[PDB]
Each structure stands twice: as C-alpha cells, then as structure tokens.
Design a protein around this ligand. Structure first.
Ligand SMILES: NC(=O)c1ccc[n+]([C@@H]2O[C@H](COP(=O)([O-])OP(=O)(O)OC[C@H]3O[C@@H](n4cnc5c(N)ncnc54)[C@H](OP(=O)(O)O)[C@@H]3O)[C@@H](O)[C@H]2O)c1
Ligand SMILES: NC(=O)c1ccc[n+]([C@@H]2O[C@H](COP(=O)([O-])OP(=O)(O)OC[C@H]3O[C@@H](n4cnc5c(N)ncnc54)[C@H](OP(=O)(O)O)[C@@H]3O)[C@@H](O)[C@H]2O)c1
Ligand SMILES: C[C@]12CC[C@H]3[C@@H](CCC4=CC(=O)CC[C@@]43C)[C@@H]1CC[C@H]2O
Ligand SMILES: C[C@]12CC[C@H]3[C@@H](CCC4=CC(=O)CC[C@@]43C)[C@@H]1CC[C@H]2O
Lengths: 319, 319
C-alpha cells in the first residue's frame, strides 16, 4: 500500500477519499461515490458523525467486502466525535453509535473533530435566540483519556485530533499519564495555506498531518466565503499543470504528498475520482515545489467562523 | 513499487541488493545470492563491470524470469562504467560488453563509477613498477555526453554518477549543452558519515543519493582500514535495535530510508538477505533519527586511497 506508518504502529494509506458531501447532495450519494472510489483503488475513507453519511458509506464498504472486492482489513476508515459529545462520559457512546450505523466492529481511526465543546444533545448545532452556538466547557485532556479508552476497548485502532493548533497539541502531548499520542492532526492545507509551521511541528512529534481542502474545499455554504478565490483557478497551478502535462488538481495533490502529508480529496464526478489516483505517477521538481510554496497567502477557506468567541477557537494567527 | 521517481521520470526501488563480493568469494557466489534476493522480494540489483559478477547476476535474473518468478520490467538493474573506459569513445563499448555478459537488451541505470580515469586497457588496475595506478586525464563532460547518447540509444533507461563531490556534480549540471542531469549520485553513507551536506545538495538538484556502506561496507582488503570500527557494533544501534525489537542492521537501513536515500545492502547469508527486507515494517521516531544524526564522525570506510594522488580524487573537498 501507498502507506505511511503512524506512531502507534498502524499503517495509513496516504491518499484518502472524503465522504462529506455538499448540503445540496442527497445523503445516499455517499454510497455510490464510495463504491466508485473503491473500484478506482481507494482504501482510505474519511467520515464523521456530523456528516450524516456514515450509514451510506458503511453500506458501500460492506457491499464491496460481500462481493469480494476488498476485505475489512484492507480498508482504513476514519470517523470523528462531534463537539456535542466531547464530554468524557459521552465519547464512547458516540463511537458505538457510529459503529452501529456502519455495521462495523471497529474504525481504524477516531478523531476529536474540533477542540471546542458544544451543549450536549441530539442537535449538532445548538443555538440560542440570537442564533449563536451554545458553547460548553470541557477538559480536552479528559476527552482524550476517553479516546484512549476507546482504543483499549478495541472500538478504534488509532486515535487522533482534527483542527488543533500546535499549542493545543502540546497540551495533550504533555498530559500527565499520557498513554497514546495523537497519531494525526487533520487540518486544512493547500498552496494558499501551506501550514509549514504546523507541519514541521507535527513531524517533530511523529504526528501525521492529514489535509483536507487540498483542492480548495467543496466551498460549503454557511462555512466558506463564497467570494473567496477558487484554488484550482490559480494561474500558477494552471501553468505548472501544462508544464507537467497533468491537471491543476493533480499538481495540488502531488504538492502535498511530496511534503509528507496524507491527503484527502472528494469529487462528485467519477472521472475525477479515477484521475486523482494518478497522483502517484509523477514527480514535481524541487524548484517547482518552491514555486508552489510561494503561493502561501493565509487564505483559510473553513475558519469555523460560527465558533469564534469560543475559548478554544484554534485559528488565531501567529505572532 | 516501494519506489521513488527519478528526475527523468523513471522509477527506482528504494531498497537494492548489491552484488559486489569480497575477493575471498568465488564470482559464481553472486548467482546464488541474487536468486535468494529475488525470492526475498528484492527487485533492485546493483553491479558494475569491475565487480566481475555481472554475468553471474544476469544468469540469476534471467533464470528467475525464465521460471516465472519475476518479469524483466519489474527488475531494476544497475551497472557502472569503470575508470579505464571513461574515454568518450569507450563508454558505449563497455556498456555493450556488460549487456553481452548479462544477455540483457538494456540496463535500467548506468553510472560513471568514479570521476577518475585510468590508462585504457583490459586491466582494471594498471600500475607501474612502483605498484602505483597509471592515471589518465579525460573530459568528464565529454564522458557524460557519451552516457547521454547511451540513454538516447536505449541501452540504459537512466544515467547517473558515483563517488562525485559537489564541485564535480556542478561541473556536469552547468555543462553547456547538457541534455540529461544525473538521476543519482551513489556514495558511501551511514551514521559515521551521514553526508548531511552532500545529501542536501543532491535533493536541491533533484538528484537521488544512493547509498552503499549503509551497514559499514564489507570491509574489502586493500580498500578498507581493517582497524577501523565496525559500524554494526555501534552501541547506539544496539540499544535502538532492542527498543524497536529489530536489529542493528535494520535500524541502520531504516535510518537512511527515512532521510530520502535509496539504500543498497549486501550479505552472504540467506537469513540476513531475508531480514533486510523487513526494513519496510517499522518507523523510527523523529527523536531517534536525531540521535542517529549525532553519530557522524567523518569515518570514510572506502576513501579510494590508491587513487589519492589522482587530480580528480573526490574526497578532498568538504563535500
Ligand atoms: N476535519 C474537518 O474539519 C474537515 C472539513 C472539511 C472537509 N473534510 C474532509 O475532507 C474531504 C474533502 O472535502 P473538501 O471540502 O476539503 O474538498 P477538496 O478535497 O478540497 O475538493 C474541492 C473540490 O475539488 C474538486 N475536484 C476534485 N477532484 C478534482 C479533479 N481531478 N479535477 C478538478 N476538480 C476536482 C471537487 O469538485 P467536483 O465534486 O465538482 O469534482 C471539489 O468540490 C471531505 O469529504 C472530508 O472527509 C474534513
Ligand atoms: N559505487 C561504489 O563505489 C561502491 C563501493 C562499495 C560497494 N558498493 C555497492 O554497495 C553494495 C553493498 O556493499 P557494501 O560493501 O557497502 O556493504 P554493506 O551493504 O554496508 O554491508 C556490510 C556488511 O553488512 C553485513 N550485513 C548485511 N545484512 C546484515 C544483517 N541483517 N545483520 C548483520 N549484518 C548484516 C554483511 O555481512 P555478512 O555478509 O556477513 O552478512 C556485510 O559485510 C555492493 O554490493 C555494491 O553493489 C558500491
Ligand atoms: C465544514 C464541515 C464539513 C461539511 C459539513 C459541516 C457540518 C454541517 C453539514 C451538513 C450537511 O448536510 C453537508 C455538509 C456540512 C456543511 C462540517 C463541520 C466541520 C467540517 O467537517
Ligand atoms: C571497492 C569496490 C567494490 C569491491 C571491488 C573493488 C574493485 C576490486 C575488487 C575485485 C574483486 O574481485 C572483489 C571486489 C573488489 C574488492 C571496487 C572498487 C570500487 C568499489 O565498487
């Protein structure tokens, strides 16, 4: 497998397929896209409880195992516990519910979606009369202890985090009695926001940086500035694509793989799912990698703006 | 394909089996060892016209292709033109001779063995009455042009160099009319001689550093100081071997792979040839890599001392 090794010994495919879909897409769409992705050669699938696509994704995977296309052990499935279940006593219950939806006995990786707790309840986005999210206070170190228990319970093989800044990672890494270090930190990363600093930090701690937004994000309404520039329309990517006889998307994907990053990607088009697998066919020169490094402009497509004000908002700029 | 991509688009397996043997071993020994390597999963084999083992190595490979074990396209074979054939008009004749000994239509890689020419002739080590090598002077840029022609003739898929220092690589890289940059520079590299500087330079130029002496070299008589320390006896390697439940050799091999180096290795023992393939099974922590970086002590096992007076002796410069 085009895999890299996690700090707990487990292997993870460097190219994963994201199962989050635009609000304008029917949930069931996730099932068909997953089947196409599997046939295209994808083994790593990224999901979350908040995506409401887990049951459909699980159906596609179980279907592909049933007909002998792949085995459960060959699939790397990731889930994430949402802000409303960060309370230590609610973490495992959330994972068990996901497993129930998937018809799985275990997930390969389980992440804390955001380092920001929200009022517990069925509603994923509890708000008051002003439409403001209802924040809740939770000890993330305790949340982590609960994640470790899930690993020891065999409900998940590995555990990690998502959307954590290095300061928050250090808190966990320096935790008294720490048992398992996060194996990864899934964050937004692309030429407009190359996370060089956070990447170097993660590498120094044996933490894998898993990137989303590698192609500019699906630009979800209510989460991304619709007036922000479209990443793949960047002239530099267009020019480099022609130089290497590839596509702007392939240039953006290869850029990250060559930096030691595990990449996620999503496309609603079958032709593009297959195309993205071609990222393993070519190499970007060291000089062109520097050119791409020059596109950095601190453009964060998903700032989780509705979370601003929360004591743990992870995206404050560096000094 | 546990492989990396060369600057000419071709793929090379990151772990290769070397076929040079101590003078105390019969040449035919290479046939047996190559077959064992192939059965253990090795697809990359390193040889040279000066090793006097090409015909035996070729026979093992052809034998394994014949009985259905492996395909030629799945094998990556490297040869090297010796000092006595650096004259531009003799480079191709040497490659053609190697192909004849191998009964191959092409080699995957062809290297200039040393940036030092010796008096042309059948004798690989021409000497005078004082037992000193008879040096010759050649236009290495002209030698390179001849290598480029060999690539354009399809006799070799890629071309590179071996034992070249920074200035000598520049000599080729800045050559007016240069058509193909060297895809690699095969040099000695291990914790006692980590080549930090030369490695950084090669990466900046898209040149892969291929390392020999990864396990301390076979300590050839007449080439290696028999009183020099044995690399695999290094305490740090022993302690790390115990920590990871591996072996000193596996630690030394993995150290190089994680630095982006293509590693060669040779063993006369079947058990060790099989063992070395296990290098893909574990990961050294970032902190432990730094510990290994600390062992550098400028210990060059193969200084090519009999060539020390040659105008182009490569080991005088800092790197
Ligand atoms: N942990 C988190 O906070 C978080 C947040 C957001 C997303 N994610 C994860 O990341 C995954 C990816 O989502 P994303 O929003 O980051 O998007 P993305 O992977 O950056 O993709 C952005 C856009 O690229 C287009 N695209 C894909 N392949 C292409 C190709 N070969 N040529 C041209 N265009 C191509 C897609 O359009 P088409 O569909 O039209 O092809 C898509 O809208 C999700 O499914 C999820 O698993 C995680
Ligand atoms: N281009 C050049 O100038 C140049 C120069 C020298 C060599 N090379 C290339 O590099 C290849 C490697 O040769 P090298 O001299 O550098 O040696 P090496 O790979 O550094 O190996 C040195 C020693 O390691 C031992 N060893 C191997 N695997 C082991 C294991 N699992 N446990 C314990 N010991 C182990 C071997 O002893 P045992 O046999 O007793 O196991 C061998 O004598 C050559 O065959 C050749 O292809 C190139
Ligand atoms: C932006 C992000 C992915 C897209 C989703 C969002 C939560 C609400 C949503 C509900 C949907 O039916 C479609 C996707 C999405 C818009 C997620 C919050 C964290 C991040 O993973
Ligand atoms: C040291 C090196 C590999 C070992 C050989 C040496 C040339 C003479 C030799 C002749 C032999 O019959 C056995 C190997 C070796 C001792 C090579 C010169 C460059 C390097 O590849």
């Amino acid at each position: 497998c085009h895999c890299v090794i996690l700090n707990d010994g487990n292997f993870i495919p460097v190219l994963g397929f994201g199962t989050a879909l635009p609000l304008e897409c029917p949930a069931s769409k996730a099932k068909e896209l997953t089947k196409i992705a599997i046939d295209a050669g994808f083994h790593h699938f990224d999901s979350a409880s908040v995506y409401n696509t887990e049951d459909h994704v699980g159906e596609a995977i179980r279907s592909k195992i049933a007909d002998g296309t792949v085995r459960r052990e060959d699939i790397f499935y990731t889930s994430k516990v949402w802000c409303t279940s960060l309370h230590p006593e609610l973490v495992r219950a959330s994972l068990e519910r996901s497993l129930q939806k998937l018809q799985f006995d275990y997930v390969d990786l389980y992440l804390i979606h955001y380092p920001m707790a929200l009022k517990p309840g069925e509603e994923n986005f509890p708000v008051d009369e002003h439409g403001k999210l209802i924040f809740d206070r939770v000890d993330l170190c305790a949340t982590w202890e609960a994640m470790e228990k899930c690993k020891d319970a065999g409900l998940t093989k590995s555990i990690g985090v998502s959307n954590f800044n290095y300061r928050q990672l250090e808190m966990i890494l320096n935790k008294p009695g720490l048992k398992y270090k996060p194996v990864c930190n899934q964050v937004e990363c692309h030429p407009y926001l190359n996370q060089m600093k956070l990447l170097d930090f993660c590498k120094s701690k044996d933490i894998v940086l898993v990137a989303y937004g590698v192609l500019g994000t699906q630009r979800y309404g209510g989460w991304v500035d619709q007036n922000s520039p479209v990443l793949l329309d960047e002239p530099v990517l267009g020019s480099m694509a022609k130089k290497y006889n590839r596509t702007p998307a392939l240039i953006a994907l290869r850029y990250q793989l060559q930096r030691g990053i595990v990449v996620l990607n999503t496309s609603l088009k079958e032709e593009r799912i297959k195309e993205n697998m071609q990222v393993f066919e070519f190499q970007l020169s060291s000089e062109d990698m520097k050119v791409l490094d020059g596109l950095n402009r601190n453009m964060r497509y998903i700032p989780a703006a509705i979370f601003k004000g929360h004591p743990n908002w992870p995206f404050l700029d560096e000094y």
